[PDB]
Every structure is written in C-alpha cells, then in structure tokens.
Ligand SMILES: Cc1cccc(Nc2cc(Cl)nc(SCC(=O)O)n2)c1C
C-alpha cells in the first residue's frame with residue numbers, strides 16, 4: 225500500500241538526516257571500503273599483513289598514529305594485535321557516540337539513558353560496521369591503510385586464534401545482503417535506540433524514536449532494494465544474531481582475562497563488559 229504522503233516524505237527526511245550524520249561520523253564508509261577491497265580506488269593500495277614478516281614491515285609502514293610504549297612493543301605479536309584491536313574498539317565507541325548524538329531525539333533523552341543505550345549498543349554496531357571492512361580474505365585496518373588476512377589472524381596462539389573468526393562468518397553472510405551506507409545509517413540508529421537495554425529510566429520515549437526509525441528502515445529497503453521483499457525481515461534476524469556474537473565475544477574475553485592475567489584490558493571496555501551478564 226506504499227504511497228507518497230506527508231508521512232513518507234518525513235521518513236525520507238529522517239533517512240537523509242541519518243545518512244548525512246553517518247557520513248560526518250565515520251571517516252571510512254562502506255562505499256570507500258569496497259572501493260579499496262576491489263582495487264577500484266585511485267588511492268595507493270593498502271599494505272597487506274599475511275604473515276609475521278609482513279606484520280613487522282607493516283608495523284613499520286602503517287601510520288597507526290597512537291604511540292605504543294616500550295612496554296607493549298616488548299609484548300608478543302598476538303597481544304600487540306589484540307591491544308591494537310582494543311584501541312580501535314575505543315575509537316569506534318567515540319565515532320558511534322558522535323553518530324548517536326545526530327539521531328533526532330537522542331540528546332533529549334535522559335543523559336544516563338543516552339549512556340546505557342551506547343554501552344549495550346556499541347559492540348552490535350562495531351560488528352555491523354566491521355563487516356563493511358571485511359571480505360573472504362581479510363579485514364581493512366588503520367582506516368583502510370592496511371589489510372590483515374583472515375588466516376594470519378587464525379594463526380595467532382590460543383586464545384587469540386579465534387577472536388575475529390565469528391565476525392568474519394557474520395560478515396560474509398551480512399555482506400551478501402548488499403546493504404549500502406544509506407541502509408546501514410538507519411539499521412545502526414534502530415539498534416542504538418533499543419528500548420529493552422537493562423537499567424534505562426524512560427523506555428517509551430526510546431521506543432517512540434525507534435518505531436519511527438523502523439518505518440524509515442522498511443521504506444528505505446523497499447525503495448533501495450527492488451531485488452528482495454525479504455530484506456527487512458532478514459535484517460531484524462541480523463539484529464538478534466548480533467546480540468549472540470556479542471555474548472560469545474564476552475565468553476572469549478573471560479577465557480583471555482582468566483588465562484592471560486598479565487595483559488591489560490582498556491578500562492573503558494572493562495566499564496562496558498562489566499554488566500554483559
Ligand atoms: C599502538 C600500535 C602501534 C603500531 C602497531 C600496533 N599493532 C597492531 C598491529 C595490527 Cl596488524 N593491527 C593493529 S590494530 C588493527 C586495527 O586498526 O583495526 N595494531 C599497535 C598496537
């Protein structure tokens with residue numbers, strides 16, 4: 225029963241606002257990532273980390289632009305990589321917080337509700353957007369300057385061997401839906417504005433902003449994806465798949481925390497993981 229009415233013109237306005245915010249908040253878009261991954265970019269090729277030699281040439285070659293002290297550099301490779309991944313996760317939180325602030329209504333929520341949403345949301349968003357940086361062979365790192373191979377990550381000693389494999393498995397299947405940035409901007413807004421995160425004070429306001437975002441998503445997918453009538457339903461099942469991947473990630477992080485008692489976990493990520501339980 226799709227129609228051009230004042231309601232649909234607004235859902236199109238909401239969609240455009242989210243996209244523009246998204247472009248402002250995330251320097252590496254899916255559009256840019258795909259261009260690099262396929263070679264079609266006019267940018268210089270990323271440096272490829274496929275083994276321990278290229279890892280060390282790459283750590284010399286790639287502009288990571290956040291000093292590792294002479295304490296972490298002393299660390300073995302698997303922990304060095306994990307700590308890099310940790311630093312990038314914290315950045316992604318920063319980027320995602322900025323984006324969620326652009327979501328109409330978000331800032332007018334109670335500041336503690338704004339904090340809860342992000343704390344239980346960010347990791348679902350990180351795995352969503354991580355898929356944009358992944359193909360079957362590997363993942364773009366350091367903002368598209370680098371490419372680390374799936375098999376090189378699998379070669380790391382236990383339990384560092386497994387931490388990315390599930391996100392690759394989620395990505396290959398998510399990426400087959402062929403979402404673009406304009407789709408992802410609404411999909412991400414929907415996730416962040418989840419009413420059923422524990423310890424929110426004001427639930428109905430968040431649900432009201434969401435059901436709106438969801439209508440905008442459904443209209444967007446119908447306009448943007450004539451090839452599927454199933455795509456909205458499939459994306460709702462992805463939202464459920466993502467909570468599981470986050471559950472299984474925490475399991476892994478405990479096995480790390482309680483057998484690698486040496487190594488540092490970023491206190492902000494410790495803050496987030498506290499109550500995923
Ligand atoms: C702070 C710093 C500087 C230079 C190299 C590294 N180690 C690495 C190595 C690799 Cl292959 N990947 C990373 S983080 C990857 C990412 O940016 O997603 N970090 C680190 C942890």
Ligand SMILES: Cc1cccc(Nc2cc(Cl)nc(SCC(=O)O)n2)c1C
Nearest residue numbers: 309310312313316350354387388391493
């Ligand atoms: C965008 C990007 C690229 C490469 C790595 C990461 N961070 C990840 C990805 C995965 Cl599969 N696992 C981790 S372990 C660190 C953590 O979130 O505790 N951190 C991120 C967020």
